[PDB]
Ligand binder design. Structure first.
Ligand SMILES: Nc1ncnc2c1ncn2[C@@H]1O[C@H](CSCC[C@H](N)C(=O)O)[C@@H](O)[C@H]1O
Ligand SMILES: [Zn+2]
Ligand SMILES: [Zn+2]
Ligand SMILES: [Zn+2]
Lengths: 429, 6, 4
């Protein structure tokens, strides 16, 4: 297996990962090559399909012209997976639209056909042994998987031989439960992957490790001191939100209620939903009314993001902030949510001044709501620093970039390519 | 595939 | 990854 670690039965949590030796903050516990992975459609042309390296002048696949590579070696190594989509993409044309989950599951089935035996990705936990929670799925979740199965059949019939429907339901459920999203240094979505040994770790809202990525290789580093006998915990979710929001997501997606110290004490809940100190204090009903409103506009914006124009999306963020500000302070996480969304729209519009203003309001509340070594905090420092440098605010840029580096050295390792890249940006402008 | 921050 |  993995030296210094062991799989064990964690009471109430199924299987888990336990330390057999001590690990200090910043230590690498283990690394795990991707069992299967896929580059997200929006990042094609910026990243190599095989190894995920970002660079300019990638070689384009001459057949489909929609997959880019470092060189012919990366291209040849990616062929067993790319051929599932190369020709279908041109033949289906505009009508080719399998969801990312379908794309990943197709590559899982292809990997199983080629490499049926245990891989180096599965030293402690195999894909076949993944938890499915099939008995807990409701009809709406089962009907969505069955829709995914139909898409899998529609788009991948010529390259894949399918198991029976029951096996496909289980596999999709296992993917929903154990799959990982890969993000770049700015926490932008890069793709999806299966990391079997990383999937073994249970969840905590005060985790003692963080998962980062070196291309398609997952790495796991301590962000708290870990002693022999202690369970290794990662976070499955965005830790910005209060306990009821976190446990709503964990129950819905992973079918458990978290009992970590943060969930048990709820010690950060009050700061996360901070209320303005008005002459007449807002009543509990009014607070719960604004929280309900906030959750609704968050959902409305998530839908609107697919079709509305950038200026229209900014309008939603502006109006929602105005209404919430009558009750919520700026450090309130529902305010911060819409500010972050507005920043995203500004970054896409290349409105650097607009994005900088939002970043400056977000970073200090982020620092206190998130844990000590949060990737959400590091990436916000990084966005600020790059905005500053781009706008020729060299001194503020350097300060922000160094703040990002200080965190990433712990989470990513001092020798990570991301840290080398960021140091160039300090000594370029 | 959902496990991750943000 | 912003386009800057
Ligand atoms: N903090 C926690 N409390 C209870 N169950 C947890 C948990 N964190 C993770 N789990 C369980 O682990 C699943 C994610 S996959 C993690 C490995 C899993 N325990 C296994 O035996 O295969 C979740 O769906 C949930 O069932
Ligand atoms: Zn490559
Ligand atoms: Zn191709
Ligand atoms: Zn928790």
């Amino acid at each position: 297996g993995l030296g210094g670690l062991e799989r064990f039965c964690s009471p109430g949590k199924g299987r888990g990962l336990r330390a057999l030796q001590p690990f200090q903050v910043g230590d690498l516990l283990f690394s795990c090559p991707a069992y299967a992975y896929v580059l997200t459609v929006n990042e094609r042309g910026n990243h190599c399909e095989y190894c995920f390296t970002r660079k300019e002048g990638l070689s384009k696949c001459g057949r489909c012209k929609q997959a880019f590579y470092c060189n012919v070696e990366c291209q040849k190594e990616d062929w067993p997976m790319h051929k599932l989509e190369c020709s279908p993409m041109v033949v289906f044309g505009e009508n080719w639209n399998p969801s990312e989950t379908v794309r990943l599951t197709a590559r899982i089935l292809a990997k199983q056909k080629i490499h049926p035996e245990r891989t180096p990705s599965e030293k402690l936990l195999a894909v076949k042994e993944f938890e499915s929670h099939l008995d807990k799925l409701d009809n709406e979740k089962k009907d969505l998987i069955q829709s995914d199965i139909a898409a899998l059949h529609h788009f991948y019939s010529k390259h894949l031989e399918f198991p029976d429907n029951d096996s496909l339901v289980v596999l999709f459920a296992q993917v929903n439960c154990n799959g990982f999203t890969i993000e770049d240094e700015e926490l932008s979505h890069l793709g999806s992957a299966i990391f079997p040994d990383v999937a073994l770790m249970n969840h905590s809202c005060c985790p003692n490790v963080i998962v980062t990525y070196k291309g398609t290789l997952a790495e796991v580093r301590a962000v708290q001191e870990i002693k022999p006998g202690e369970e290794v915990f990662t976070s499955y979710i965005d830790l910005l939100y209060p306990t009821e929001d976190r446990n709503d997501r964990l129950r819905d997606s992973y079918f458990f209620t978290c009992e970590c110290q943060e969930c048990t004490t709820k010690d950060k809940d009050k700061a996360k939903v901070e209320i303005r100190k008005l002459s007449d204090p807002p009543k509990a009903e009014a607070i719960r009314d604004m929280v309900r409103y906030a959750r609704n506009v968050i959902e409305e914006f998530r839908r609107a993001k697919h079709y509305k124009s950038p200026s229209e999306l900014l309008e939603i963020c502006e109006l929602s902030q105005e209404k919430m500000s009558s009750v919520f302070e700026d450090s309130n996480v529902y305010m911060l949510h819409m500010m972050y969304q507005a920043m995203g729209v500004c970054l896409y519009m290349q409105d650097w001044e607009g994005a900088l203003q939002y970043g400056q309001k977000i970073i200090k509340p982020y620092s206190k709501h998130y844990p000590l070594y949060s990737l959400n905090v590091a990436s916000m420092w990084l966005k600020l620093g790059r905005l500053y440098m781009g706008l020729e605010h060299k001194a503020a840029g350097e300060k922000a970039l160094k703040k990002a580096i200080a965190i990433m050295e712990v989470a990513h390792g001092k020798d990570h390519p991301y840290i080398s890249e960021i140091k160039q940006e300090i000594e370029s402008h | 595939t959902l496990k991750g921050g943000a």
